[PDB]
Design a binder for this molecule. Structure first.
Ligand SMILES: COc1ccc(N2C(=O)CCC[C@H]2c2nc3cc(-c4c(C)noc4C)ccc3n2[C@@H]2CCN(S(C)(=O)=O)C2)cc1Cl
Length: 114
């Protein structure tokens, strides 16, 4: 099945909207991690392929995803990076987990019906 970008946007955008609707949980994920601003010079030692909601949104908006799995991969990349870098005791890690739960719940029926 070849998907039109507009069909992908239509189908997938609500799952991204669900992530943004999580407040305050999505707030650390809405822009790329800035290690200079945050004083964390080892961030890019640990995280080689950064990802965040703004990047995912731009890619969906501009039709960069050919297939739904590619979107799903970038969402999980974002989550995996945050789980890798941050300690499980941290607020950011727990918020990562909350967003991943919401994502799993929302993406499931969407993938089925694609
Ligand atoms: C709304 O939730 C938060 C709001 C602020 C915090 N923060 C603190 O509690 C301590 C001060 C720094 C701040 C904060 N920590 C961030 C961590 C990340 C991040 C992620 C994701 N993956 O690895 C790292 C590292 C990202 C942002 C963090 N911030 C603030 C939240 C919003 N900003 S910003 C100004 O760059 O857009 C920085 C953390 C959380 Cl979970």
């Amino acid at each position: 099945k070849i998907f039109k970008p507009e069909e992908l946007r239509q189908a997938l955008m609500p799952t991204l909207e669900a992530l943004y609707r999580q407040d305050p949980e999505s707030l650390p994920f809405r822009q790329p991690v800035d290690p200079q601003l945050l004083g964390i010079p080892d961030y890019f030692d640990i995280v080689k392929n950064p990802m965040d909601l703004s990047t995912i949104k731009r890619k969906l908006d501009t039709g960069q995803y050919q297939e739904p799995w590619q979107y799903v991969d970038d969402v999980w990349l974002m989550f995996n990076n945050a789980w890798l870098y941050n300690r499980k005791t941290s607020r950011v890690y727990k918020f990562c987990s909350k967003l991943a739960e919401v994502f799993e719940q929302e993406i499931d029926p969407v993938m089925q019906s694609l």
